Design a protein around this ligand. Structure first.
Ligand SMILES: CNC(=O)c1cc(-c2ccc(C)s2)[nH]n1
Length: 164
């Protein structure tokens, strides 16, 4: 069912995360971590302190899909185990240095064709698939987007609820 999912999403904040490649999303799904540009890292750290759940909704550029969504379980931290991200053309790993811990809520994909009816007020009411990396998604749009994903029966949200 969807009741624990709705509980986790209650009063949450939502951010669109754009990866240039599948490799980084696969690494994030395997290791429970994410890193972003410093401009976005500052926004996510502020959001983590301000809301009961901060949700990252992932999309690999040019894939036409979202690849899942996850909840921040920490602010960003440096000096942990290194993560072998595939780095965009220009600038090095010092940029992607802050590491957030995340708990996956859904590792299933959702094609953009299924979210065409959702627009994001914080991006000019453009379709929610449209947005830069780090674009915040308004509460109602983000909740409905997450509820469109196929259920991920491998996930138990009991442990996430306890972290709140
Ligand atoms: C592990 N993190 C990543 O792959 C990643 C890459 C980005 C980028 C946003 C805008 C770019 C030119 S690059 N934001 N996050």
């Amino acid at each position: 069912g969807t009741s624990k999912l709705k509980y986790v999403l209650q009063d949450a904040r939502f951010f669109l995360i754009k990866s240039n490649n599948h490799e980084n999303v696969s690494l994030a799904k395997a290791k429970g971590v994410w890193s972003t540009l410093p401009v976005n890292e500052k926004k996510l750290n502020l959001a983590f302190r301000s809301a009961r759940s901060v949700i990252l909704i992932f999309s690999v550029r040019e894939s036409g899909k979202f690849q899942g969504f996850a909840r921040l379980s920490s602010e960003s931290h440096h000096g942990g185990s290194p993560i072998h991200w595939v780095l965009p053309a220009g600038m090095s790993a010092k940029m992607l240095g802050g590491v957030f811990k995340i708990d996956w809520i859904c590792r299933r994909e959702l094609p953009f064709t299924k979210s065409a009816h959702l627009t994001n007020p914080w991006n000019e009411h453009k379709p929610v698939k449209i947005g830069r990396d780090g674009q915040e998604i308004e509460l109602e749009c983000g909740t409905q987007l997450c509820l469109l994903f196929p259920p991920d029966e491998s996930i138990d949200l009991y442990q996430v609820i306890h972290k709140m």
